[PDB]
Scaffold this active site. Structure first.
Site, short mmCIF file in Angstrom:
data_model
loop_
_atom_site.label_atom_id
_atom_site.label_comp_id
_atom_site.label_asym_id
_atom_site.label_seq_id
_atom_site.Cartn_x
_atom_site.Cartn_y
_atom_site.Cartn_z
CG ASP A 11 -21.06 -17.14 7.16
OD1 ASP A 11 -21.54 -17.25 6.01
OD2 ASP A 11 -19.90 -16.72 7.37
CE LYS A 59 -11.20 -17.07 15.85
NZ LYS A 59 -11.14 -15.99 14.81
N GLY A 100 -6.88 -8.60 17.70
CA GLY A 100 -5.46 -8.86 17.57
C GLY A 100 -5.09 -10.09 16.75
CB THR A 101 -1.87 -11.63 16.03
OG1 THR A 101 -1.18 -12.23 17.12
CG2 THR A 101 -1.46 -10.16 15.92
CB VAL A 102 -5.65 -15.93 15.71
CG1 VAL A 102 -6.14 -17.27 16.23
CG2 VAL A 102 -6.79 -14.96 15.54
#
Ligand SMILES: [Mg+2]
Ligand SMILES: [Mg+2]
Lengths: 260, 57, 247
Positions: free
Chosen positions: A116, A18, A1-3
């Protein structure tokens, strides 16, 4: 979804949300979900200053898992672009590097490979504290053994650290390549083509894929760096992952010993 | 068919009462978390309180 | 070298085991229906299940840790203690095994007293009540660290390890597992194990004297207290052999 993002009025610090939408089946919570979330809970107990703190795990039930994290607005790329025109002072760089290494050493001591590391996921508080961000959940920063698709463990992070270390002096990345073969070619341009008995087995590209090349002097790419910091840079930018310096060892290098 | 380790330990379960209780407990924790962060985790949208939530693209 | 990191790792493990500790007082202070005798009954059954299904050796102690922690926070009815124990095994198996115990098989092992839908809902309750602190240090963690420091033949370490795991399971069935931290259960289990069940005159390359002092030094206890722990473990063994054989 949206943070989502919000300021803490208990302090002035920020917090973010998150959330992963996990596949619920007949065996309940997935194995990877309980293990990975529990690993974040275990780290949180040590309260290490150079990783983002996990504030909560809010699961709702298919099943949905929402994590509340400490939020740091500024990453290192932004910290470096705001640097004074002449660049960051040497003492500031050694300070960022000490914190970077302590944070990474912490993850490695807990058998986490970040995998990363890039300036985009290294955060810097307005107070100057470095915090590692998106762990346990572009090819420029990638260790040779990963670009070769062979075995990889924690040394792959120390290769990335060397790249970022050199980048703090140049304010532009060290090796910029289009593919794995290209990224490797640029690497061997600097550190030289490794010898035959240093090449991994069952690798994606043979050694004949690359023309013969010797090492350039490493301070040609960071001429503003002191000589001993250049020695330390070389020990990070070491092809054999078993000879590459570990994070804990880099913290004992004299170049990073704070005076007084 | 039934190993000897297969046994009920402490008698009958009242299953409907158990289900009622297990969802009360769970919804209670969800409500408390939603109140802790003033954020509706179930629908993933913010509420109003200490925390002024905003999106970050 | 590996010595500097082994120091750090052990120091880190001792700090981690403080975060996943139950309360020694939960029978007196939280539980109304669940008595210590019922803890031993559900733990004895959990252990038989883990042994029947050939679980990795950490599953059963890890499940008891979850059980003692849930009981330090929440009253549980007698009729739901088994459900808590099955759920603790369920989650511990996911943490420690490649192919975890299945929900259906755990229900069979309660003689179908509990149902799969109830196991899954209890799993969400248990995990959320523990705030997802599932990665608890187990005595097995400390046993392997101790054994990596003992200069013994692998043959002998294998026997020492087997005995110590047996001793760890024994402690987990008794209220000792509640007060003593995993490092202390592990150390006592190891020094008990190097006695080889009194079957042979011990012939260890690191003397028992040097071992007990080494172990006491690194888990930060008096050597007297490590010997009291070992004695409790050997009394637990003596009791369980008497209880077993009589029926
Ligand atoms: Mg499933
Ligand atoms: Mg990160």
């Amino acid at each position: 979804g949206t943070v989502y993002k919000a300021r803490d009025p208990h302090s002035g610090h920020f917090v973010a949300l998150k959330s992963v939408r996990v596949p619920n089946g007949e065996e309940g919570l997935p194995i990877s979900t309980v293990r990975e979330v529990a690993l974040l809970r275990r780290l949180e107990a040590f309260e290490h200053p150079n990783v983002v703190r996990l504030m909560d795990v809010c699961a709702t039930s298919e099943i949905k898992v929402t994590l509340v994290f400490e939020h740091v607005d500024q990453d290192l790329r932004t910290y470096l672009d705001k640097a004074p025109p002449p660049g960051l002072p040497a003492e500031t760089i050694k300070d960022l590097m000490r914190q970077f290494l302590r944070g990474l050493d912490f993850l490695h001591a807990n058998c986490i490979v970040h995998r990363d590391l890039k300036p985009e996921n290294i955060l810097v508080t307005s107070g100057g504290t470095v915090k590692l961000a998106d762990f346990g959940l572009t090819l420029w920063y990638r260790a040779p053994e990963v670009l070769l698709q062979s075995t990889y463990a924690t040394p792959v992070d120390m290769w990335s650290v060397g790249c970022i270390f050199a980048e703090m002096f140049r304010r532009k990345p060290l090796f910029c390549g289009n593919s794995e073969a290209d990224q490797l070619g640029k690497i061997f341009d600097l550190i030289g083509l490794p010898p035959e008995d240093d090449w991994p087995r069952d690798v994606s590209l043979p050694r004949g894929a690359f023309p013969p090349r010797g090492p350039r002097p490493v301070q040609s790419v960071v001429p503003e760096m002191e000589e001993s910091g250049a020695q330390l840079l070389l020990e990070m930018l070491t092809f054999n992952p078993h000879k590459r310096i570990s994070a804990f060892r880099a913290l004992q290098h004299s170049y990073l010993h704070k005076d007084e | 068919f039934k190993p000897s380790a297969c046994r009920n330990l402490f008698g009958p379960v009242d299953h409907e009462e158990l289900t009622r209780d297990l969802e009360k407990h769970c919804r209670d924790m969800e409500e408390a978390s939603q109140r802790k962060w003033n954020f509706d985790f179930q629908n993933h949208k913010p509420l109003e309180g200490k925390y002024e939530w905003q999106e970050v693209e | 070298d590996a010595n500097l990191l082994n120091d750090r790792v052990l120091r880190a493990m001792l700090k981690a085991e403080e975060t996943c500790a139950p309360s020694v007082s939960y029978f007196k202070c939280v539980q109304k229906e669940v008595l210590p005798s019922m803890r031993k009954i559900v733990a004895t059954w959990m252990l038989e299940v883990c042994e029947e299904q050939k679980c990795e050796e950490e599953v059963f102690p890890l499940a008891m840790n979850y059980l003692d922690r849930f009981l330090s926070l929440e009253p549980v009815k007698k009729s739901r203690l088994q459900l808590l124990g099955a759920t603790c095994m369920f989650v511990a198996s996911k943490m420690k095994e490649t192919i975890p115990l299945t929900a259906e098989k755990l229900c069979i092992y309660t003689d179908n007293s509990i149902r799969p839908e109830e196991l899954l809902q209890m799993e969400l309750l248990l995990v959320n009540k523990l705030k997802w602190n599932l990665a608890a240090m187990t005595p097995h963690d400390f046993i392997e660290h101790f054994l990596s420091k003992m200069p013994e033949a692998e043959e002998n370490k294998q026997i020492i390890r087997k005995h110590a795991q047996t001793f760890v399971a024994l402690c987990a069935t008794d209220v000792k597992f509640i007060s003593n931290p995993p490092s202390m259960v592990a150390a006592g289990s190891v020094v008990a194990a190097v006695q080889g069940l009194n079957l042979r005159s011990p012939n260890n390359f690191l003397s028992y004297y040097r071992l007990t002092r080494f172990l006491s030094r690194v888990i930060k206890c008096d050597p007297d207290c490590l010997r009291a722990c070992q004695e409790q473990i050997e009394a637990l063994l003596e009791s369980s052999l008497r209880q077993a054989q009589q029926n």
